[PDB]
Antibody, heavy 213, light 214 residues
Framework: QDQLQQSGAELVRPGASVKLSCKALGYIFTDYEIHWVKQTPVHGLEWIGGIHPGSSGTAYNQKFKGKATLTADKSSTTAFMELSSLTSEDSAVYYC?????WGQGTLVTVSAAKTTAPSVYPLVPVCGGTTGSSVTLGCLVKGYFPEPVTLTWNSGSLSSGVHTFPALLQSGLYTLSSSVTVTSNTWPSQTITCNVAHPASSTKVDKKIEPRV | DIKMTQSPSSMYTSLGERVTITCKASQDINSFLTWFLQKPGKSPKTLIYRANRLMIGVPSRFSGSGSGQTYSLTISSLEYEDMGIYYCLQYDDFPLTFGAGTKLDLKRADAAPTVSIFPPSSEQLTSGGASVVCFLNNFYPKEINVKWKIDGSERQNGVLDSWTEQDSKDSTYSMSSTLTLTKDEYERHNSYTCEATHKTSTSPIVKSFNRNEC
């Protein structure tokens, strides 16, 4: 065994607190220290602190002293991480490591935004002459919350010529685009649909790409 | 505080050759270095511990080296499962600190993008917003220029890009550019162009449209 198993993803409102957990299995949880690491696209990896299941001695990174709080429980074989007075800034993937074995990470998202179903818009080329041997069509999913969204074209039959793009963020609401490239003999004769699903708000929408009139 | 500097930040290699990464700390760290790998939605996995020692289930193509301040990881034969991001960790003194990362990407022949521009949709214009979208699909390498022009002038505020990682079907990259305006702002001007520069051609690649067809 190597194992370290982390708590589940958390979606939290600003000013609250979360307590992450990191379960150790297959070794004697007491003989090695657990370290908590922060991952942000903007900042790479950052060390928060570490705890000794054995001696109970905590070390904190000066940046995180006062935000983070490590603790342990010897019977459960788990190390905890209470992050406090959260702000946008704490949104990231948090890990638990022993230096040799890492947990899987637990994602935290701190936001004020309520559930918001997307707005799907179809993106057809411009009216006149723009038809070479292939045409590219589009689809715009704007304004959702929170993150996961399923986007498919003609529910699976189209996969070759698809490009969906990592959702950006625009005022705390997500925005996503997807493109599709087909032959001239395909559209607009046969129909091309933009399938969009957002479980959270329970939206399932097919939006056809009609030619511009 | 103790600094780790990694090099290069990214490379272009083709499966089967020898790559070599580097970390260099700001002070001697007396071989307390781990080298780990991070892959698309995975668990960072340690390959090398204490500068040159392997790890439980790791191939021998990986090989740690160096001492003092300069440490260098080797891969004699880049396998396809080796693609991802390599980091280095110093754990001599607190606080523990890491390198920036090194992204290994598949090499390939040059490929110019196929650009497409898209006027907003009518449904969106009814709400108040107007998003103009440019797609820059299947190009290599990753380095690209996208400028937006409203009636011949460059616009910078309100532009927002999203990239995809390497396509594992052609090893290209794709780009989505969106310029978002009010419907009010949008309707004050007429011509909208999306202009891309890239290694493949000295002249930029232009796609535009007039707001009332002409």
């Amino acid at each position: 065994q190597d194992q370290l198993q982390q708590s589940g993803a958390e979606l939290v409102r600003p000013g609250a607190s979360v307590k992450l957990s990191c379960k150790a299995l297959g070794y004697i949880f007491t003989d090695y220290e657990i370290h908590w690491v922060k991952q942000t696209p903007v900042h790479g990896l950052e060390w928060i602190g570490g705890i000794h299941p054995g001696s109970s001695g905590t070390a904190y990174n000066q940046k995180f002293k006062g935000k983070a709080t490590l603790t342990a429980d010897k019977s459960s074989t788990t190390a905890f991480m209470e992050l406090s007075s959260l702000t946008s800034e704490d949104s990231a993937v948090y890990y638990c490591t022993r230096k040799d074995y890492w947990g899987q990470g637990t994602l935290v998202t701190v936001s004020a935004a309520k559930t918001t179903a997307p707005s799907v818009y179809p993106l057809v080329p411009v009216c006149g002459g723009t038809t070479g041997s292939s045409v590219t069509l589009g689809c715009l999913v704007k304004g959702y919350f929170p993150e996961p969204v399923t986007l498919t074209w003609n529910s699976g039959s189209l996969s070759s010529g698809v490009h969906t793009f990592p959702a950006l963020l625009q005022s705390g609401l997500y925005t996503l685009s997807s493109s599709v490239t087909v032959t001239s003999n395909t559209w607009p004769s046969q129909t091309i649909t933009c399938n969009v699903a957002h479980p959270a708000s329970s939206t399932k929408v097919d939006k056809k790409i009609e030619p511009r009139v | 505080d103790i600094k780790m500097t990694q090099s290069p930040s990214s490379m272009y290699t083709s499966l089967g050759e020898r790559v070599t990464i580097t970390c260099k700390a700001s002070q001697d760290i007396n071989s307390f270095l781990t080298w780990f790998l991070q892959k698309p939605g995975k668990s960072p996995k340690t390959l090398i511990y204490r500068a040159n020692r392997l790890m439980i289930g790791v191939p021998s193509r990986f090989s740690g080296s160096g001492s003092g301040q300069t440490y260098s990881l080797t891969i004699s034969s880049l396998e396809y499962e080796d693609m991802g991001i390599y980091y280095c960790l110093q754990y001599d003194d607190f606080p523990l600190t890491f390198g920036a990362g090194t992204k290994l990407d598949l090499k390939r022949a040059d490929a110019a993008p196929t650009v497409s521009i898209f006027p907003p949709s009518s449904e969106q214009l009814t709400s108040g917003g107007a998003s103009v979208v440019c797609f820059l699909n299947n190009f290599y390498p990753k380095e690209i220029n996208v400028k937006w022009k409203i009636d011949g002038s460059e616009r910078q505020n309100g532009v927002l890009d999203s990239w995809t990682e390497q396509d594992s079907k052609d090893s290209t990259y794709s780009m989505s550019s969106t310029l978002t305006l009010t419907k009010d702002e949008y309707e004050r001007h007429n011509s909208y162009t999306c202009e891309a520069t890239h290694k493949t051609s000295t002249s930029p690649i232009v796609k535009s449209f007039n707001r009332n067809e002409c």
